[PDB]
Amino acid sequence: FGRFTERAQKVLALAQEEALRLGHNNIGTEHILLGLVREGEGIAAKALQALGLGSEKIQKEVESLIGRGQEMSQTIHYTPRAKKVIELSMDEARKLGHSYVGTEHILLGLIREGEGVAARVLNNLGVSLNKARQQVLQLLGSNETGSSAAGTNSNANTPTLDSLARDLTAIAKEDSLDPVIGRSKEIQRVIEVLSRRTKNNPVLIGEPGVGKTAIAEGLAQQIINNEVPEILRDKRVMTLDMGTVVAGTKYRGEFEDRLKKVMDEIRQAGNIILFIDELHTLIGAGGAEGAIDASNILKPSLARGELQCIGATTLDEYRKYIEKDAALERRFQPIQVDQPSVDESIQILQGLRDRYEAHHRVSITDDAIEAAVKLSDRYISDRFLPDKAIDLIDEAGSKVRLRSFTTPPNLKELEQKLDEVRKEKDAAVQSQEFEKAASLRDTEQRLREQVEDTKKSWKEKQGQENSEVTVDDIAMVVSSWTAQTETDKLLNMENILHSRVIGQDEAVVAVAKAVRRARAGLKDPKRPIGSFIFLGPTGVGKTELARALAESIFGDEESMIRIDMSEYMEKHSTSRLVGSPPGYVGYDEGGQLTEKVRRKPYSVVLLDAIEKAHPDVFNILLQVLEDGRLTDSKGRTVDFRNTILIMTSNVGASELKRNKYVGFNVQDETQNHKDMKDKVMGELKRAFRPEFINRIDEIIVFHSLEKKHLTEIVSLMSDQLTKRLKEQDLSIELTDAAKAKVAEEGVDLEYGARPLRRAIQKHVEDRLSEELLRGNIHKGQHIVLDVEDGEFVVKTTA
Amino acid sequence: FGRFTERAQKVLALAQEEALRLGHNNIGTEHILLGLVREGEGIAAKALQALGLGSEKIQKEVESLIGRGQEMSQTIHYTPRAKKVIELSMDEARKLGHSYVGTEHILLGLIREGEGVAARVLNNLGVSLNKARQQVLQLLGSNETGSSAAGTNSNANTPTLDSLARDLTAIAKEDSLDPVIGRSKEIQRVIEVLSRRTKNNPVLIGEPGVGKTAIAEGLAQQIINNEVPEILRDKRVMTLDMGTVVAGTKYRGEFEDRLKKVMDEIRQAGNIILFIDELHTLIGAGGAEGAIDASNILKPSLARGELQCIGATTLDEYRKYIEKDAALERRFQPIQVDQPSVDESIQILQGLRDRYEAHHRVSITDDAIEAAVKLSDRYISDRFLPDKAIDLIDEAGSKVRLRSFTTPPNLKELEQKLDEVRKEKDAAVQSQEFEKAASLRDTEQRLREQVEDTKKSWKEKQGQENSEVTVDDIAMVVSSWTAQTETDKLLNMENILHSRVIGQDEAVVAVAKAVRRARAGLKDPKRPIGSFIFLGPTGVGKTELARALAESIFGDEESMIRIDMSEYMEKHSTSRLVGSPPGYVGYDEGGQLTEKVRRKPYSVVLLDAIEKAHPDVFNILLQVLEDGRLTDSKGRTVDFRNTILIMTSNVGASELKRNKYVGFNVQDETQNHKDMKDKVMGELKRAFRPEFINRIDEIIVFHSLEKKHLTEIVSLMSDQLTKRLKEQDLSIELTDAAKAKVAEEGVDLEYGARPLRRAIQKHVEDRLSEELLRGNIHKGQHIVLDVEDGEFVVKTTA
Amino acid sequence: EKDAALERRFQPIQVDQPSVDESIQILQGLRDRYEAHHRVSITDDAIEAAVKLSDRYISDRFLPDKAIDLIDEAGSKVRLR
Numbered sequence A, B: 001f002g003r004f005t006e007r008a009q010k011v012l013a014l015a016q017e018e019a020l021r022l023g024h025n026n027i028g029t030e031h032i033l034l035g036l037v038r039e040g041e042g043i044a045a046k047a048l049q050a051l052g053l054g055s056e057k058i059q060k061e062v063e064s065l066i067g068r069g070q071e072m073s074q075t076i077h078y079t080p081r082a083k084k085v086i087e088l089s090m091d092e093a094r095k096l097g098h099s100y101v102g103t104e105h106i107l108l109g110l111i112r113e114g115e116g117v118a119a120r121v122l123n124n125l126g127v128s129l130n131k132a133r134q135q136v137l138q139l140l141g142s143n144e145t146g147s148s149a150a151g152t153n154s155n156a157n158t159p160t161l162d163s164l165a166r167d168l169t170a171i172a173k174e175d176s177l178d179p180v181i182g183r184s185k186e187i188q189r190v191i192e193v194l195s196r197r198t199k200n201n202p203v204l205i206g207e208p209g210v211g212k213t214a215i216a217e218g219l220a221q222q223i224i225n226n227e228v229p230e231i232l233r234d235k236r237v238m239t240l241d242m243g244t245v246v247a248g249t250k251y252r253g254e255f256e257d258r259l260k261k262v263m264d265e266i267r268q269a270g271n272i273i274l275f276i277d278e279l280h281t282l283i284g285a286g287g288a289e290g291a292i293d294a295s296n297i298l299k300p301s302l303a304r305g306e307l308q309c310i311g312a313t314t315l316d317e318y319r320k321y322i323e324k325d326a327a328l329e330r331r332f333q334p335i336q337v338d339q340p341s342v343d344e345s346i347q348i349l350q351g352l353r354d355r356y357e358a359h360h361r362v363s364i365t366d367d368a369i370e371a372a373v374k375l376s377d378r379y380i381s382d383r384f385l386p387d388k389a390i391d392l393i394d395e396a397g398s399k400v401r402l403r404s405f406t407t408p409p410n411l412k413e414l415e416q417k418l419d420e421v422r423k424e425k426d427a428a429v430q431s432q433e434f435e436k437a438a439s440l441r442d443t444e445q446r447l448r449e450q451v452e453d454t455k456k457s458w459k460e461k462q463g464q465e466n467s468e469v470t471v472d473d474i475a476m477v478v479s480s481w482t483a484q485t486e487t488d489k490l491l492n493m494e495n496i497l498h499s500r501v502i503g504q505d506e507a508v509v510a511v512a513k514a515v516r517r518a519r520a521g522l523k524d525p526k527r528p529i530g531s532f533i534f535l536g537p538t539g540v541g542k543t544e545l546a547r548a549l550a551e552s553i554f555g556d557e558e559s560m561i562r563i564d565m566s567e568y569m570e571k572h573s574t575s576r577l578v579g580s581p582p583g584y585v586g587y588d589e590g591g592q593l594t595e596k597v598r599r600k601p602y603s604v605v606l607l608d609a610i611e612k613a614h615p616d617v618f619n620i621l622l623q624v625l626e627d628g629r630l631t632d633s634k635g636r637t638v639d640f641r642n643t644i645l646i647m648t649s650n651v652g653a654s655e656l657k658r659n660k661y662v663g664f665n666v667q668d669e670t671q672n673h674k675d676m677k678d679k680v681m682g683e684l685k686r687a688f689r690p691e692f693i694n695r696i697d698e699i700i701v702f703h704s705l706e707k708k709h710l711t712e713i714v715s716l717m718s719d720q721l722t723k724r725l726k727e728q729d730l731s732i733e734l735t736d737a738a739k740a741k742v743a744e745e746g747v748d749l750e751y752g753a754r755p756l757r758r759a760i761q762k763h764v765e766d767r768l769s770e771e772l773l774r775g776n777i778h779k780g781q782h783i784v785l786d787v788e789d790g791e792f793v794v795k796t797t798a
Numbered sequence C: 001e002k003d004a005a006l007e008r009r010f011q012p013i014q015v016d017q018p019s020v021d022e023s024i025q026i027l028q029g030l031r032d033r034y035e036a037h038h039r040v041s042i043t044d045d046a047i048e049a050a051v052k053l054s055d056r057y058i059s060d061r062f063l064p065d066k067a068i069d070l071i072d073e074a075g076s077k078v079r080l081r
Helices: A006-023 A029-037 A043-051 A055-063 A080-094 A103-112 A116-124 A129-137 A157-162 A185-192 A213-224 A242-246 A252-268 A279-283 A295-304 A342-353 A366-378 A387-406 A412-431 A435-455 A471-481 A484-491 A493-498 A505-518 A542-554 A584-590 A592-599 A615-627 A669-679 A681-687 A690-695 A710-726 A736-746 A755-772 B006-022 B029-037 B043-051 B055-063 B080-094 B103-112 B116-124 B129-137 B158-162 B185-192 B213-224 B242-246 B252-268 B279-283 B295-304 B342-353 B366-376 B387-405 B412-431 B435-454 B460-465 B471-481 B484-491 B493-498 B505-518 B542-554 B584-590 B592-599 B615-627 B669-685 B710-726 B736-743 B756-772 C020-029 C044-056 C065-080
Strands: A203-205 A236-240 A272-277 A309-312 A334-336 A533-535 A560-564 A604-608 A629-632 A636-639 A644-648 A699-701 A731-734 A782-787 A792-797 B236-240 B272-276 B309-312 B532-535 B560-564 B604-608 B630-632 B636-638 B644-648 B698-701 B731-734 B782-787 B792-797
Touching: A006 A029, A006 A043, A006 A055, A006 A080, A006 A103, A029 A043, A029 A055, A029 A080, A029 A103, A029 A116, A043 A103, A043 A129, A055 A116, A080 A103, A080 A116, A103 A129, A116 A129, A157 A236, A157 A252, A185 A213, A185 A334, A242 A252, A242 B252, A252 A272, A252 A295, A272 A279, A279 A295, A279 A309, A342 A366, A342 A387, A366 A387, A366 A471, A387 A471, A387 B185, A412 A435, A471 A484, A471 B185, A484 A493, A493 A505, A493 A542, A505 A542, A505 A699, A533 A681, A542 A560, A542 A604, A542 A644, A560 A592, A584 A592, A584 A615, A592 A629, A592 A636, A615 A629, A615 A644, A615 A690, A669 A681, A669 A699, A681 A690, A681 A699, A710 A731, A710 A736, A710 A755, A731 A736, A731 A755, A736 A755, A736 A782, A755 A782, A755 A792, A755 B505, B006 B029, B006 B043, B006 B055, B006 B080, B006 B103, B029 B043, B029 B055, B029 B080, B029 B103, B029 B116, B043 B103, B043 B129, B055 B116, B080 B103, B080 B116, B103 B129, B116 B129, B158 B236, B158 B252, B185 B213, B213 B236, B213 B272, B242 B252, B252 B272, B252 B295, B279 B295, B279 B309, B342 B366, B342 B387, B366 B387, B366 B471, B387 B460, B387 B471, B412 B435, B471 B484, B484 B493, B493 B505, B493 B542, B505 B532, B505 B542, B505 B698, B532 B669, B542 B560, B542 B604, B542 B644, B560 B592, B584 B592, B584 B615, B592 B630, B592 B636, B615 B630, B615 B644, B669 B698, B710 B731, B710 B736, B710 B756, B731 B736, B731 B756, B736 B756, B736 B782, B756 B782, B756 B792, C020 C044, C020 C065, C044 C065
Parallel strands: A203 A309, A203 A334, A236 A272, A272 A309, A533 A644, A533 A699, A560 A604, A604 A644, A731 A782, B236 B272, B272 B309, B532 B644, B532 B698, B560 B604, B604 B644, B731 B782
Antiparallel strands: A629 A636, A782 A792, B630 B636, B782 B792
16 A cells, blocks of 8 residues: 555655666566666665675666667656556565565565566676575564564563463554553553452443444553552463363363363462453343353452453443352452543544544545534434444545546546557457557557556545545535535425325424424434324325435435334224234334334334334333433344434324315314324323323324325325336326325325325326236327316327 | 267368268268368367378278269168267367367367277278377367466465355456346445455345345456455455355254364465355354354454455345344445346346257347346246246247247158058068068158258257247246236126126226236235125135136136135124133244145135234235235245135125115115115124225125026036036936026025026936936936926937 | 345246046056066056045045055955966
């Protein structure tokens, strides 16, 4: 990758100097050899001077193999030979430490990639290719820090510290360690609980989900220097890792044997600190099943403080070891973990943003980092409060770097030409068309040199991207999942929800704004994007809106769950009846509802007809509404702050089914509305709870549809009709006259907007198929469903 | 086979020349040798010139072995020896550079198949046969484009890239790759998501269902050239395959040991891209078991960006990463997948239609391809829109070539003779019958040459077929499962359904047309080929029509499921105070009904008496009606856009059992009709939901056997009786007089055409059997069941 | 259920076998070689009995299969007698 060591580049530019200076159109391998030795004292350069391969000796040879006299040096880039030598050396510097690649690797790599003119020059000047590669190597001693060897104290430490495993202290005494940003208060809290003569074992409980190891690198650093109490003298830190034990082992007995032995060597006791990662698995206690009961050996080991340990586990588990007893009540002992507060989150991000300038996009913007965090927290949301962010920073921190190469001035067009030539050209040479390929070749290669020239004009494509990562940038990426492509979603939300639900527009504008509030980060991060009860007679726009929300917010028409609450009867379990009675709160909690929302958390959850449930189901929904979490199956907290929870109802059925119709009213319509927003809202209270409605945010009342909401939905349906048949090459259109006649079936008090489907089906689909088979209408031919007598009448058009 | 290179054919034809030129009847192996060397610088030819064997040197030997003087050249095709040399060379050219087989293989193959006259020529001309085969062989070299290597590059990359596995880039630098056809939209979404840092991993969700790896060829291409952010350059691309790891191992432990090791070598980080197919199995998250929990190692591998990866996952699978954190919820990230749309689908087909020129029956017709696709979506009807298609294309892509083997020129008749001769001849040669075998032999061999001549007149079936798939043909194959064998089914559907149901002819034409509507295409491809409710006396023609549909559409009488919904009532019978509950809806939804209909994916589903079921059953049916899917058992979507859902009913029973009846007058029909078509259709709706009926296409009312439905159903049953006994040699007939008396049992308003079986049993089986046993009637003689007094009388007739 | 290199790769076809009378004929066809089982050939009617008697009663096998057990059984039973 980028930002390599000079020495490489330096030998190379001297090659280019020879390219024209000796007359080669190629900066060749002959020139690279000259390049190395004229760069003097690079390990490559230096090496050549030892074996007897001075610049003089080399150049004498060089001139005898090409030398002269292509001084003009047309298209001076390398030979393909040289391009291989460079690529190889780069890896030969990965190989022999020097991430940022320099001279040693280049001669070493040259020999490896020892071909063409270079190779022959030295084997002619009495130096074997390996005699040179040797020479570089024996002057090389690669690049490293923190290590040089001179010996340290040990004895009893020998058998123990070997086994098994990682040593956090080692990498921190080689000083390659990055803090990594604390996660600070835990670290103190371990050492009280650690250096100790009884109950010597810390147990870190908290977020997993913070990168436990951030605390750990914390610990490492402070356990060395220097305020730790002499309770434990000498002080060595050894990590015990389950993963190393299990690998290459197929039976349980062998793993235990190794643990037994390790535990014995752990006898460096009262001086040694043991890190037990995933501590619970070993304890094998609590619940109806353990996870492997190493605990039997481990328990006295922890208690003695021989295997005093720091446990990196989970919230509940430490208890489920003191539940085992009695070396967890005189061994284990808990302390409360820290993670980076939402603003702090942003700051951690920033700290390693500038080094994912290795992908060359960010390197900042701050506002964008902030955007990553803030925008994510309310919309997707599928992950914990800091994690989401950084992924997005980096996401846009690449996304937009694609938009550079697309929009320069669109100097993609250059390349576009170079292809078109090549193609033409090539195919012309395959037939020949010699000079008929030639001018194309020349046009091609014209293009080519220009291309490589404007590709290093596409350092502007770096200057575009390499620190931009903006608010909008991030937002767009967060939106890719889910500012930029969320605020066109926000600003036009009403319009967008209106474009899919034209069925009780009153309701649509309200829902639009409520979601847009939450999605603008204006609600608790511990509450859903929408709680609702949707009162209304059957599917007025209710169901349809759940769909439209998915469509507008989530970027797919359906990203929408949909469960009928009437199967969870509880208090209505003789008031409707069902095939399967035994389960109901168990069905929602125990698996069904919870698993579905777990699949895509960003899902508009539509719980139909919620009045056909006891108040107990509502408590869970209230807990969703409050906590922004649901507590369910497999001990999960599923964070509701993704979901738009929408609960429908026909609870005050009588008012709901009293319509709201433009044709007969507009003042009784807004008072059938008003009638439903109170008498429904009290049938709502008897079939819900006021407590429920109090954690539910807005009770949206739908009314059976007006004249006029219908005929617009039908004109979408008729268009949905027209679109799916055109793909297969058949044209139908219903005139406005025909879309109107179809709309009428969705009128009742009772209905709302599902019967529209029936009426498009009956008057369009069914009707057209009985006319295409008839020979009234045909393929491609535009088939007009018109009204010309108050009934459909089929006219034909082109 | 697979078509050959010139060089083969060229050496071969030179053989035929030496046949006549030296006088040989069948072009022997002596000519094949001459043929090879006379092709000059063929690899075969050339080889022999090395061996010292010129055309001359060979021929001097040749004339002394056969040579003279069958200049008549009787039946000049090869010797079977020579034909063997060709079969061998072909595969030995598959072996040695040539799919399309040439010269090299022919000498090489000759040596292998070194026999008779050929063999003796070279071993006489001082040349060992393998010295010759050597000679051909040593004139080989690389022919695999993008390969002929002699260069060297890179270093550190070595340990990692070995293991394990496939490398899409490699085959695309040897460019055998076929792009193919996008499935475009995933590919952009990867590079934002993959030039990142903190999280760096794309995860492609859904659509499996397109051949996911095709999208991968997309990825391959874009990660190389050229719009990519900085860490996505210096990248190397590895595909990870489960198959290579599992192969050669048994126990799970070995797979993990290798997997930990692999993730470690994956340390080429920020320069490596890993493709992880079937990502879920390794992650293992949630459920009762998500498969092998590699996740412990794998999650940090993904998170670190060492095993920066592209996840190929599915609908449900996403749950099992976002459920884990923060190294599967700091790894996962979703991206929007597409396939090549229904028109695009067609185009993929077309592209490899022409490439069944190893099948030579299609290459084209386009319209037929178009048909393949378009017809498939409704005609079975549960798979992706191009796969269905190719089965048709290819089926039909033999079917007309099958029509060859009878009439079109039918020079099959020649062959038909030639066989018959051989027999006569043969048996004559075995008996002797010398000259009596002779003339038969002559008749045979007459035939043979004529056959061989007309067998390359049966190049005409290639010139017939390798256009044309036949639209009609293709249609026929979709129908074979589900123009040609589908439009006779469509056009005459009422007639065909009428020929099996005479129980309500009114009903038949209606059902006919509705199935024919969908099956001719104009219905949403998310709805069954029919939804219906069938009201009527029960079994009127109702059950029988479901049968008749199976019969008409599929060519199998029965391909028809059949469940009684009244058993899953939950409408007047579920549970009591302290008595145990049932499971009824759980049984239909949860597995039983859905699994059964899944077996024949297209099937007339007959749900009897659904009005005795509660409104809840209808919602499930509603999913068929909406989705053309049913969502059931282990997360399957079973595409009910196939099926013909036919639901029977009677809940306005009284009116349907006071139904149309012409025997009680014509004006009793249309006022029993008018009465039943409203009070029934509202007891129907009251026993359904209007919403149910709103996505049910038609409510068909059946009327007990009016006067006029009966004796023809009876004359089919009574005739079915008479037909099943004839096969085993017993002739019975019921006269029209006896078929009339049988028909009388069901004239009942209450009954349908169900009681008819009993009256065939009573009046035919029972009546005859008590007479066959007493010898009033017998075996093979004709047994007339007639009426002669208003009661049956069995008369006997020859 | 798997698809679409398993559902639209696969494609079904209708199997057949000798009709009930045809059954009689299969039996008969290898009757003469049940003269390595010395009894059977003859009678037509006997094969026919095998098939026909079985089809409604025993009825424990499939429509041609039933037959041959009788044929061969009896194709020794009387041959023992």
